[PDB]
Amino acid sequence: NKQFAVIGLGRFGGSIVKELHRMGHEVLAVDINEEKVNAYASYATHAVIANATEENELLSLGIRNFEYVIVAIGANIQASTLTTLLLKELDIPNIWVKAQNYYHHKVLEKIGADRIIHPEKDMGVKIAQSLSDENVLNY
Amino acid sequence: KQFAVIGLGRFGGSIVKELHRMGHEVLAVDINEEKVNAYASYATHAVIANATEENELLSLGIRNFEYVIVAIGANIQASTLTTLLLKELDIPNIWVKAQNYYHHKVLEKIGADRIIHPEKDMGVKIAQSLSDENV
Amino acid sequence: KQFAVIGLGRFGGSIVKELHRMGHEVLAVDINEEKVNAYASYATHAVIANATEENELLSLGIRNFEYVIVAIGANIQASTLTTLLLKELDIPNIWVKAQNYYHHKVLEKIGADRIIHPEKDMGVKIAQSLSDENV
Amino acid sequence: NKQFAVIGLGRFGGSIVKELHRMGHEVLAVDINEEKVNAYASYATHAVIANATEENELLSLGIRNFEYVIVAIGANIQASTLTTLLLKELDIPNIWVKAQNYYHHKVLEKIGADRIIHPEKDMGVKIAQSLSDENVLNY
Amino acid sequence: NKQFAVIGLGRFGGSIVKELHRMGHEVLAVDINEEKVNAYASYATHAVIANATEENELLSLGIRNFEYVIVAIGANIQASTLTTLLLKELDIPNIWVKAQNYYHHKVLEKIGADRIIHPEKDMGVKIAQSLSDENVLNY
Amino acid sequence: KQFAVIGLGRFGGSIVKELHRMGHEVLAVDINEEKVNAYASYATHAVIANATEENELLSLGIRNFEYVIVAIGANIQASTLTTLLLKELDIPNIWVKAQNYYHHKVLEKIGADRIIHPEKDMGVKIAQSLSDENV
Amino acid sequence: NKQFAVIGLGRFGGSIVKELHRMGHEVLAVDINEEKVNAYASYATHAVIANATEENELLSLGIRNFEYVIVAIGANIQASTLTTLLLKELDIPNIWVKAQNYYHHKVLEKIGADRIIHPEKDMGVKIAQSLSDENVLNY
Amino acid sequence: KQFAVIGLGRFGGSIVKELHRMGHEVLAVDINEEKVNAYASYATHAVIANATEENELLSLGIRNFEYVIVAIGANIQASTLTTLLLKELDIPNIWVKAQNYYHHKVLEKIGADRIIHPEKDMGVKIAQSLSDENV
Ligand SMILES: NC(=O)C1=CN([C@@H]2O[C@H](COP(=O)(O)OP(=O)(O)OC[C@H]3O[C@@H](n4cnc5c(N)ncnc54)[C@H](O)[C@@H]3O)[C@@H](O)[C@H]2O)C=CC1
Ligand SMILES: NC(=O)C1=CN([C@@H]2O[C@H](COP(=O)(O)OP(=O)(O)OC[C@H]3O[C@@H](n4cnc5c(N)ncnc54)[C@H](O)[C@@H]3O)[C@@H](O)[C@H]2O)C=CC1
Ligand SMILES: NC(=O)C1=CN([C@@H]2O[C@H](COP(=O)(O)OP(=O)(O)OC[C@H]3O[C@@H](n4cnc5c(N)ncnc54)[C@H](O)[C@@H]3O)[C@@H](O)[C@H]2O)C=CC1
Ligand SMILES: NC(=O)C1=CN([C@@H]2O[C@H](COP(=O)(O)OP(=O)(O)OC[C@H]3O[C@@H](n4cnc5c(N)ncnc54)[C@H](O)[C@@H]3O)[C@@H](O)[C@H]2O)C=CC1
Ligand SMILES: NC(=O)C1=CN([C@@H]2O[C@H](COP(=O)(O)OP(=O)(O)OC[C@H]3O[C@@H](n4cnc5c(N)ncnc54)[C@H](O)[C@@H]3O)[C@@H](O)[C@H]2O)C=CC1
Ligand SMILES: NC(=O)C1=CN([C@@H]2O[C@H](COP(=O)(O)OP(=O)(O)OC[C@H]3O[C@@H](n4cnc5c(N)ncnc54)[C@H](O)[C@@H]3O)[C@@H](O)[C@H]2O)C=CC1
Ligand SMILES: NC(=O)C1=CN([C@@H]2O[C@H](COP(=O)(O)OP(=O)(O)OC[C@H]3O[C@@H](n4cnc5c(N)ncnc54)[C@H](O)[C@@H]3O)[C@@H](O)[C@H]2O)C=CC1
Ligand SMILES: NC(=O)C1=CN([C@@H]2O[C@H](COP(=O)(O)OP(=O)(O)OC[C@H]3O[C@@H](n4cnc5c(N)ncnc54)[C@H](O)[C@@H]3O)[C@@H](O)[C@H]2O)C=CC1
């Protein structure tokens, strides 16, 4: 497995790990909290305990070898920004990051994030789309 | 055809704005005037109201909507009461944002037709978006 | 004849102790072992359990009780889910301590047969106790 | 009205005020919070805004003229103890106090309270009694 | 030693323990904090670790056998009041208590304290007296 | 003969009131007007002033007092600077309330003629008061 | 005046404003706190009250017209990063920023800061240099 | 020739590292072992010690140094006592980091030969660095 890596196994991160597994994809799952890493042992090709803000730990992880790395760190803008900053130095092809708010988003754009995710807002758009389909698509 | 969104937080507001961009009419509602003002331009009608009050629900004409989205956040109790009431008004489709597991569990037994989990649901979207990189 | 008390706080524990003093058998339950131990000597049986879990509710034999008192406090969501479940098990009498107004409102629509408000109810008791000074 | 006085119009205090009114009894209702005093205007023979811990305010109230005074101050042991301390000096015939916990109860006994109320626990006993009646009294 | 007992070995309590020792008096020194009890081993006829608010511990101490008991509990009105309440039940001949403020003093009077000490204020009076002596007594 | 008290907290205020009761004149000073007002009736003169400012110290006429008591509390730095200045003005007797050990240590090297420790000093008073029970 | 602009008038920022004035340089001094802006009226060619994180306010300031802009925002990494982010978009020739710590520094590098200042550490080097001069330069 | 730095925070540590890079010997001292370990490799000697204690100051041989930099931070009282003591030991040059205005004022009267204000001093450096852009 060297295509998908998810850092931060909260509701958002853990959910992509699981869905990837369900779809038969191998995934590197990482978190600083062991209780979180263990909760995703059955869904990860490899579940490691590591501080994503530490360079050496990012090398002991081989994160440089992944095409897509999702930073799903939650209510910790600093760990989130620091992490995306490091792996952007490792010139990772695709770095996706969950943003906490407008400020976070603003630094993430210039810091290296290729895609920025706002769960709340983004799901609101998809829900709007589903509602529209109920009617329009005569669904 | 009717769409009503109760609770104009990031999630609720975003669906109101989307429905508007997609040229759909939408009743936006929230107990906080400041929240209502924020999305007044996107809704065919933006009303201040406590979705917990049956009287405020009837003068709202909510009973006449096909789809009502309860997007209350931290106020779990209000989210639960609100859905209980909409169910009493027999709304055809009631979609509710679940704050957590216990919330989902009561919502399921209460009459929510669809329960939305933004973080979890978005995570599945991203996993699927991640696969499509090689479609 | 059967009595079961879920949630052994000041209120719930006090009813367990009273039932015992009045020579009645009672099933005492709480998710916290320390709470259960505190009233073990007063209950015919004191069990650790999360009243939210259907599995833990069935192995508890709660379905066989005539009266079940849900005395969950601050955890409003657990109080609500618990009562929803007991209602599914068709308990004959389900009495619930209400934490606040919204709580009372959902409990009423959920199937609680009696809703208890300690402070308010005690206040009425005292007012009545105050009149009796001249009976 | 000079028989019942209730200090502290929370759930507990406000409830006795209301029940007394319902039963046709006149009652002096007092609270330091005006929004609380106004909420009980329709149920009190007199609803006054006053700090029960201040002696002069207790005299400007004429509290010395009541046979029963209920101290229903809530999560403020100090205001509660201080208040019962003062009116005990005013040698009030009956002083009833809502206690917050065991400690509060302990000082209240020696400080002058004639009756001490523990809503939570006390209601638990009455509920136990009602349950017993459902069966025993064949009710 | 069964004449003096000091509960609460802070600056105030520890200081009376020490001065008593200096004057050749035996003293029972008690505190809930072991690091405090050990700091006064060399000055106490007996230095015990105990929660003064617990009755049994007050009996395991034999506090009932002392003519004077000083409650020198500091910034903990509750532990202070509770403690003086208990030993007043043990009908101790003299109970002296350091008060934190006016409120504390007010409960202490009715609760059983024979003497109440306000270090700050009281020392202010003695300092005033010393100043007066510098001049008046031609000292 | 002159007495001046800087810092009208419990300690400082109490000495001002005592000196007054003992028919002595006293200059009471504090940076906080509310503190000064509290002891205005006990002092021959109650002045608002920042004892740290040399200008405010000279217009105060502090230099003309025989005894100046610095009773500053939590503001250790102000207590220290104030005493440094009074020493520059060569006040005959400067008595300072020490907040803690480090404070006492600098006060001793700074020129405080007497350093007062309320809690400790009162404790010795009580021990001595305790012995006198059998005098 | 259109050469130097200082945002954040704390000890650090206010000090450069003053020194610039002393040297006869015109300077734009800005702060969100009016009490801070007024404290530097006598030293600034223009002292304005403005939120540096707001774009429009940065345009109402004409900040785009300055060769050097110092961001001296203190204990507010977010306002600091956000501000340097904006003026970097305004393509300001030289943006100097006081960093709070290593993390701040890390984002500042990639975000656009041309020079990053760490007062504490940096002064430590100059003090070391002065000590060395006392001896080495036989000074 | 002798250099001693007391207080190895950002400021103090930085001067120790600089002196080392400039090939100078330096005695680094701090009450916290973790702080001392951090700069052990940069100092000719790194010692754990409470600069407030005269005994620990003498066994430190501080009296034999030409320049002693007191870089204590938040602990203003320790900074003040420490400098008072070094002055008693007649250190030739005592440089002290001032935490604030009151601190500077006592340090000046206490015997500090140089008082350093990092933020303010750096600000003047930057203003001067800003002018030099056109030298
Ligand atoms: N966590 C909390 O205490 C609270 C969270 N919330 C809300 O909960 C919502 C959902 O949260 P979730 O998605 O469940 O979790 P989350 O938002 O906390 O996800 C962060 C995950 O990343 C991991 N992580 C943090 N720093 C890391 C680092 N340096 N390296 C590697 N992993 C690291 C954490 O251990 C954690 O599992 C959020 O939107 C938030 O607003 C609300 C209140 C409190
Ligand atoms: N609000 C705050 O101060 C803080 C919030 N957070 C986190 O931010 C997260 C995201 O918050 P959002 O979803 O944007 O806000 P939200 O969760 O409050 O959004 C729900 C919306 O429903 C409205 N509402 C509530 N009860 C209602 C009723 N009875 N009738 C009608 N409308 C009603 C609210 O006014 C609000 O605008 C939260 O889940 C929380 O954990 C973290 C720190 C502080
Ligand atoms: N607990 C605390 O630290 C504090 C509580 N308070 C106040 O004290 C008041 C009185 O508290 P109490 O009524 O004595 O306690 P409580 O409200 O917690 O009592 C409810 C009991 O139900 C149990 N319970 C909760 N969820 C359960 C579940 N799913 N299944 C089974 N049992 C479950 C709890 O363990 C608890 O013993 C509260 O209303 C609160 O506002 C104030 C400050 C702190
Ligand atoms: N008030 C709060 O912020 C919280 C209360 N709770 C719980 O809520 C429960 C029920 O509370 P309630 O009965 O509704 O109210 P309460 O317990 O606050 O009642 C106190 C009432 O007395 C009044 N009062 C206070 N000091 C007074 C004085 N010196 N003189 C005259 N009146 C004075 C207050 O304004 C208030 O209306 C309590 O058992 C408590 O554990 C739990 C969390 C927070
Ligand atoms: N302790 C603190 O964190 C702070 C104290 N202060 C001030 O410091 C001043 C002087 O304080 P001190 O006299 O040194 O100490 P103190 O005021 O804390 O003395 C209390 C002593 O009694 C002991 N104690 C507490 N509960 C007890 C119990 N139930 N049974 C037996 N012993 C018990 C404590 O362990 C402690 O040694 C006070 O006037 C206070 O205003 C100011 C800020 C913080
Ligand atoms: N003030 C508060 O909010 C709290 C205080 N405490 C404790 O209460 C204890 C007792 O406090 P007190 O001795 O009554 O008050 P205090 O220690 O503040 O009294 C010193 C007096 O000196 C005055 N003063 C300060 N700097 C001055 C200057 N430069 N020139 C002239 N006057 C100046 C102050 O305004 C004050 O009235 C304190 O030691 C503290 O630990 C505990 C909690 C809160
Ligand atoms: N400010 C505080 O409450 C505390 C500061 N400190 C320390 O004090 C040291 C020195 O602080 P100073 O240099 O005096 O001040 P500072 O570090 O607070 O400087 C920030 C200045 O920038 C201004 N500012 C903040 N956000 C702004 C925005 N969006 N747009 C424009 N201006 C904005 C502020 O009003 C303030 O005057 C710091 O290194 C800090 O560690 C320590 C404890 C508390
Ligand atoms: N330490 C903390 O948890 C926090 C600090 N800050 C701010 O960070 C700023 C910068 O801190 P720094 O300068 O890096 O640290 P600092 O101000 O603590 O550095 C002084 C050094 O002197 C040492 N020291 C203190 N008393 C001593 C004595 N008697 N003998 C010998 N050594 C002694 C200390 O151990 C420390 O390493 C502070 O001014 C503070 O306002 C802000 C938040 C938290």
From Swiss-Prot, chains A, D, E, G:
GO terms for molecular function: identical protein binding; monoatomic cation transmembrane transporter activity. Catalytic subunit of the KtrAB potassium uptake transporter. The 2 major potassium transporter complexes KtrAB and KtrCD confer resistance to both suddenly imposed and prolonged osmotic stress. Disruption phenotype: Impaired potassium uptake. The keyword NAD applies. Coiled coil: none annotated. GO terms for biological process: potassium ion transport. Homodimer, tetramer (dimer of homodimer) and octamer (tetramer of homodimer). Part of the KtrAB complex formed by an octameric catalytic ring of KtrA and a membrane associated dimer of KtrB forming a potassium channel. It comes from the Bacteria. Belongs to the KtrA potassium transport family. The lineage of its organism: Bacteria, Bacillati, Bacillota, Bacilli, Bacillales. It is found in: Cell membrane. One of its GO terms (cellular component) is plasma membrane. NAD(+) binds at residues 11, 31-33, 51-52, 73-75, 98-100, 104, 120. Keywords: Cell membrane, Ion transport, Membrane, NAD, Potassium, Potassium transport, Transport. It is a peripheral membrane protein. This is Ktr system potassium uptake protein A. Residues 1-117 form the RCK N-terminal domain. It comes from Bacillus subtilis (strain 168).
